[PDB]
């Protein structure tokens, strides 16, 4: 369309702009923007300023340049120019800058400075293909929208639910009373949620210290306003720190079932994020469903073919057979290094000079490899060097042929890198690894866009949070954007989803606490990882494609007895009986009574089962049984149960549950997913080996770089972990009038890198994405041997954690993809009347003009629920009563209206109506309960009043249907869930005594006690969530004294009552991991294996609309031609749609 | 290089020998070759093969004119043809250039046409000397096991 327009000089200047150079200029000056701003962030702290103070003009420089390009834009296409997206955003940013400094000139506030950070996107704006990338990412968001709302729906539904019971608890959380030693009773009148702390007391005063707040000291999380509940629901959805919400609420009445709420919430948020993964993978299958070098190799190899005293060495270029045998010998040489990489490393703090003469052996292996590279040099001279790998290995062996020089011990540490040469083996696996690395070339651009998002978000963050940064009292503050790298590590922090929470509660707390403008700051985090993790989720699809591209590439009488069906029936009654008995034994106290009859029962079942093994054994088993899983399972059932209680621990009663487990084999549905799993582990075992080898690599890295470190003192004020001795002040809060002595120092830092085994230890913890930044930070306090400190010493070390984490972002992410592909092939394997006045009222109601009306009524009820502020004092409460009365009357009235219809079918027919009837019932009942108020359960009834919202979902057509897909999906996978229970149900009991009697205290073991079985179910449930388990693990290595009221032991105490048992948690995380993997594949096969196809159909065909066409078919009969004529109108209408 | 491998490996067994006569020529005016390779000399070389094979030693001919397996089809010799494959003509282009190329292309493309299942017993498509020599050597060891049953001695 353009505007105004003019010839003359304008066309010439535009022709100049049609050239080339200007592009590079604008781009590079944008780069100048990026750099200058990245510096500009350093620092801030309100006023002061330093070097940036001159840059302050320079942004005006960029301004005027860009503005000159705007003068060029005048020559562009005006209104026609607006149509371009990149040009649109560019013009936008231009307006932000013009308005920016244009406001600034009058100033001769900080929001303008925030608007400064908009610039970097222009870097994308100048770059081709990134537009293709982002145009791709936008497409991804659509086939997800429903579920997002569903999340929001839960986020609302739970909120309103939280806006009841938890709002009823909002009456609790907002207040407290207490005194004396922090021993006030929990959850029994006059009780309250406590601040975390290593002690907790909260001076207020309120007698001797108060005792309960969490709306601000814990930060916002309080359920009072609907908004804050929406917040706490976000973080609880994040599967991060939420359990603290639980122990808080539970601290104050009570252990009823808050857990039902948090468990349903966790499990569902889980369910549907898994569904998100399903949507993404569905996009993968969508693109791939239609989507589904030898020449040069022949060239190089045949040139090598024609290519074919020193001449004896030329004979040695091919000779001889020994060169094969020598490879076996070579396996020894690297093996000597395989220990040496540890042996030169082991131990730590100068302990054990294991490399007493190992250096000579290193010189010897260096001599052998040098002899090999030398003979290879004799083999073909320069042609041997033509291959880069040969000269590389030769340069490595020569590097080992060097010397102790020099001062950079990391060069000595490169010997660990020399160990990589041992990875040369493993035939064909390297090719698969090449297939893996090949994907990186594809995903790298998107990774760069991720780097960009990281960049903009980081800078803006720096100019926001760190743009104030300051927070008087009282450490550790951790990362808080005080400097650009700091913001890097912290953005990357919350990006992991690790403990972002505390960051955020430094965030809102930074702006003077919650109010009205400051709380808005929260939005950033909500903008952030919710999109940021989303960006990560987006990354999956890339791999999802690339990886699939690779995929695209008179004994007879007893025989009558055991085989008898009646014997199996007595075995069935025995099954129900033994199950009832073991379930009776599920409580810890059951053994205290007469459990012996149950032992006789389990003995009978073990007898019949071992007899079944005896029956199968006589019929061509043995070696077949050695091959077959089942008969081997029964024979192993025979031998393992026979293991003595003496010598190596065992407990036969725990095996009593196992005897009926064989019946699970009779189910076939589990066998498909299971066969899929056994097919899966074989499919990607090499990757697992690669990961473990990475564990070795980073192990060797950390050990010969950190071993002297971490032997921390208290605090930094001691440095030398030997200079440490005696007491040490601790000032509570900040005031230098509240001293408390402590026999402090030293500290083992929980996870030494003194040992490569310990390296496997801690490195696994960071592998969990759980608790690492603490380890990171203290790693940054490192220096020399026995010393910590300080602040931000040795920042370069921080680079390392990230690097490894980045690799975790690869293969782990690959792992989950792998399963899916087999399943995708597995799915392919799976593919292999009315009358009188009633006639009048029915006509009026059936018209469903009321539908929009009733809908509006419901939404207004929603807003009435939004009214729920529990500040002070009354007035509005009575109004709320009146409102609830209003809606309940309107609704019950409406149900009466519907009652005035089919009646015999209106009371049922279509099921939701019945549900509505339920609603009316609970509504009226609760109302009467309100009348009787002139009682605690009435809250649980008001829940029913909240349940009305679901009716909105009833109106949510082409959305609830997806939930119906979830419903049809729901059944088949449930069989696995029993094992999902059983995996706990075993280990819990298996732990229930072992880790039992660990004493309640205040460690990681208080309201989170291991005591009764159900609580054990919880403490093993946290581990499922990746919720700070390692601390709990740390508690269990030696623990405390008994339950400090139990049988204890004797005079013995001294926390001696617990001992090493890392294996339990460690193994359990993995078992839980694999079991959950099974949960993935189960959900997938039972749903998206159909449901993704359902997305493909609903997005294109009309299989779903056809049901609506049948609904049109309802308004008819059953023939004949007259029915065809009456339906001809609706038919002629339908086909157009 | 191939005969070098076959010789140093199959030492004491293999009996490689050159054949100046064109054995493919071997099968009331008497037949006579118009070629310098007289048919009677060919008969003499065939008898030399009949004598050389009598010792039950391995034999690997180095015939010059036999560019294609089909030529030996009429022979009573029943040769063990070997096929040193180069599937890509461009590769052999660059090979011969790396040191008459066009007729070499028609010939190599011709040998590419042939049915591997019958026309050839072994395909030396391997690029490196080591693996290809391992294959052909394992093959000749297989034939060696085939021709020498334990009962014979
Ligand atoms: Ca976590």
């Amino acid at each position: 369309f353009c505007l105004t327009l003019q010839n003359p000089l304008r066309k010439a200047c535009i022709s100049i702009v049609e050239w080339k150079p200007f592009e590079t200029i604008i781009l590079l000056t944008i780069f100048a923007n990026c750099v200058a701003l990245a510096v500009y962030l350093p620092m801030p702290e309100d006023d002061n300023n330093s070097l940036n103070l001159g840059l302050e003009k320079l942004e005006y420089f960029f301004l005027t340049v860009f503005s000159i390009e705007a003068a060029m834009k005048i020559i562009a296409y005006g209104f026609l120019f607006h149509q371009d997206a990149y040009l649109r955003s560019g013009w936008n940013v231009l307006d932000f800058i013009i308005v920016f400094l244009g406001v600034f000139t009058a100033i001769l506030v900080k929001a303008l400075r925030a608007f400064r950070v908009l610039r970097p996107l222009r870097l994308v704006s100048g770059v081709p293909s990134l537009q293709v990338v982002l145009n791709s990412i936008f497409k991804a968001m659509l086939p997800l929208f429903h579920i997002a709302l569903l999340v929001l729906f839960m986020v609302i539904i739970y909120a309103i639910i939280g806006l009841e019971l938890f709002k009823g608890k909002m009456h609790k959380t907002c207040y407290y009373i207490g005194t004396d030693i922090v021993a006030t009773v929990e959850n029994e009148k006059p009780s309250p949620c406590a601040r975390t702390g290593s002690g907790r007391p909260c001076t207020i005063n309120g007698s001797e210290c108060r005792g309960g707040w969490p709306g601000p000291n814990h930060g916002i999380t309080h359920f009072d306003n609907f908004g804050f509940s929406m917040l706490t629901v976000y973080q609880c959805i994040t599967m991060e720190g939420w359990t603290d919400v639980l122990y808080w609420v539970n601290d104050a009445i009570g252990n009823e079932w808050p857990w039902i709420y948090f468990v349903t919430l966790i499990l569902l948020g889980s369910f549907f994020i898994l569904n998100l993964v399903l949507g993404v993978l569905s996009g993968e299958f969508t693109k791939e469903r239609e989507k589904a070098q030898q020449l040069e190799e022949d060239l190089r190899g045949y040139m090598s073919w024609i290519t074919q005293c020193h001449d004896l060495v030329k004979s040695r270029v091919f000779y001889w057979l020994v060169i094969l045998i020598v490879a076996l010998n070579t396996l020894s040489i690297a093996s000597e290094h395989h220990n040496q990489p540890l042996w030169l490393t082991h131990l730590q703090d100068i302990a054990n000079r294991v490399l007493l003469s190992l250096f000579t052996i290193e010189m010897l292996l260096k001599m052998y490899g040098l002899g090999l590279r030398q003979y290879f040099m004799s083999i073909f001279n320069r042609f041997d060097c033509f291959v880069v790998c040969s000269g590389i290995l030769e340069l490595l062996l020569v590097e080992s042929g060097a010397m102790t020089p020099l001062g950079i011990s990391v060069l000595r540490c490169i010997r660990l890198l020399r160990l990589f040469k041992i990875t040369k083996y493993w035939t064909s696996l390297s090719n698969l690894v090449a297939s893996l690395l090949n994907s990186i070339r594809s995903i790298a651009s998107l990774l760069l866009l991720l780097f960009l998002f990281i960049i903009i978000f980081a800078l803006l963050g720096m100019q926001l949070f760190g743009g104030r940064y300051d927070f008087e009292d009282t450490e550790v503050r951790r990362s808080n954007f005080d400097n650009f790298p700091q913001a890097l590590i912290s953005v990357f922090q919350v990006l992991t989803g690790e403990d972002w929470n505390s960051v955020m509660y430094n965030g809102i707390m930074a702006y003077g606490g919650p109010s009205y403008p400051g709380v808005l700051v929260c939005i950033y985090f909500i903008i952030l990882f919710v999109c940021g993790n989303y960006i990560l989720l987006n990354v999956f699809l890339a791999i999802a494609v690339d990886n699939l591209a690779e995929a695209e590439s008179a004994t007879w009488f007893t025989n009558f007895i055991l085989l008898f069906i009646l014997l199996s029936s007595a075995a069935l009654a025995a099954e129900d009986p033994i199950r009832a008995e073991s379930v009776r034994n599920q409580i810890l106290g059951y053994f205290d009574i007469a459990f012996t009859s149950v032992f006789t029962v389990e003995i009978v079942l073990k007898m019949t089962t071992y007899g079944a093994f005896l029956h199968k054994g006589s019929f061509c088993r043995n070696y077949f049984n050695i091959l077959d899983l089942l008969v081997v399972a029964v024979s192993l059932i025979s031998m393992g149960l026979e293991s003595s209680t003496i010598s190596v621990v065992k407990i036969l009663r725990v095996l009593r549950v196992l005897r009926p487990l064989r019946a699970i084999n009779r189910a076939k549905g589990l066998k498909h997913v299971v066969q899929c799993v056994f097919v899966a582990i074989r499919t990607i075992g090499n990757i697992v080996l690669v990961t473990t080898l990475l564990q070795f690599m980073f192990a060797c890295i950390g050990v010969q770089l950190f071993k002297g470190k971490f032997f921390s003192c208290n605090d930094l004020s001691k440095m030398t972990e030997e200079e440490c001795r005696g007491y040490y002040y601790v000032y509570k809060d900040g005031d230098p009038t509240q001293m408390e002595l402590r026999p402090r120092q030293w500290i083992h830092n929980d996870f030494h890198f003194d040992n490569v085994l310990s390296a496997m230890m801690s490195l696994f913890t960071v592998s969990t994405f759980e608790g690492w930044p603490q380890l990171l930070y203290r790693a940054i306090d490192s220096n020399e041997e026995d010393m910590g400190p300080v602040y931000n010493n040795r920042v370069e070390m921080a680079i390392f954690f990230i690097i490894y984490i980045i690799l975790i972002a690869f293969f782990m992410m690959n792992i989950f993809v792998g399963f899916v592909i087999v399943t995708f092939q597995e799915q392919g394997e799976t593919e292999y009347p009315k009358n009188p006045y009633q006639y009048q009222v029915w006509y009026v109601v059936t018209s469903s003009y009321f539908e929009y009306l009733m809908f509006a009524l419901i939404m207004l009820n929603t807003i009435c629920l939004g009214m729920q502020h529990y500040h002070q004092s009354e007035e509005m409460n009575h109004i709320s009563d009146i409102l609830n009365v209003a809606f309940t009357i309107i609704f019950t009235l409406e149900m009466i209206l519907k009652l005035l219809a089919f009646k015999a079918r209106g009371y049922f027919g279509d099921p939701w109506n019945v549900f509505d009837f339920l609603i009316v019932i609970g509504s009226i009942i609760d109302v009467i309960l309100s009348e009787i108020d002139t009682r605690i359960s009435s809250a649980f009834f008001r829940l029913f009043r909240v349940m009305r919202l679901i009716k909105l979902l009833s109106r949510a057509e082409g959305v609830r249907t997806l939930l119906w897909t979830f419903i049809k999906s729901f059944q088949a996978l449930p069989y696995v869930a029993l094992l999902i229970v059983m995996l706990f149900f075993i280990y819990a009991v298996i732990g229930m005594q072992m880790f039992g009697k660990i004493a309640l205290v205040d460690g990681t073991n208080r309201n989170n006690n291991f005591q009764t079985f159900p609580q054990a179910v919880l403490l093993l449930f946290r581990c499922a969530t990746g919720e700070a388990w390692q601390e709990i693990l740390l508690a269990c290595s030696y623990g405390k004294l008994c339950d400090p009221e139990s049988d204890y032991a004797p005079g013995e105490e001294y926390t001696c009552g617990t001992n090493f048992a890392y294996y339990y948690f460690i193994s359990f995380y993995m078992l839980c991991a694999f079991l959950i993997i099974n949960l993935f594949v189960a959900v997938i096969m039972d749903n998206f294996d159909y449901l993704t196809r359902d997305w493909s159909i609903l997005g294109x065909x009309x299989x779903x609309x056809x049901x609506x066409x049948x609904x049109x078919x309802x308004x008819x009969x059953x023939x004949x031609x007259x029915x065809x004529x009456x339906x001809x109108x609706x038919x002629x209408x339908x086909x157009x749609x | 290089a191939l005969f070098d491998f076959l010789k140093h490996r199959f030492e004491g067994r293999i009996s490689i020998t050159r054949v100046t006569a064109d054995i493919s020529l071997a099968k009331a005016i008497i037949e006579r070759s118009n070629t310098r390779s007289s048919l009677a000399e060919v008969q003499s070389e065939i008898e030399r093969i009949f004598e050389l094979a009598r010792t039950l030693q391995l034999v690997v001919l180095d015939a010059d004119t036999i560019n294609h397996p089909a030529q030996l089809s009429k022979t009573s010799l029943a040769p063990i043809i070997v096929y040193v494959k180069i599937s890509s003509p461009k590769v052999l282009q660059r090979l011969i250039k790396s040191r008459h190329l066009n007729v070499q292309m028609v010939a190599a493309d011709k040998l590419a046409q042939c049915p591997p299942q019958e026309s050839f017993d072994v395909i030396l498509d391997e690029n490196q000397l080591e693996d290809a020599c391992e294959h052909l050597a394992d093959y000749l060891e297989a034939y060696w096991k085939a021709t020498h049953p334990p009962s014979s001695n």
Side-chain angles (χ1 to χ4, degrees), chain A residues 214-216 219 221-224 228-229 231-232 235 245 248 505:
Chain A
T221 187
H222 200 278
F223 292 92
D224 187 70
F228 292 168
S229 64
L231 172 62
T232 190
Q235 66 174 17
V245 181
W248 282 334
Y505 302 159

Side-chain angles (χ1 to χ4, degrees), chain A residues 20-39:
Chain A
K20 180 181 171 63
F22 304 164
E23 298 175 350
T24 303
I25 305 303
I26 303 301
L27 188 146
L28 298 178
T29 189
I30 288 171
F31 183 85
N33 290 125
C34 181
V35 176
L37 294 178
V39 177

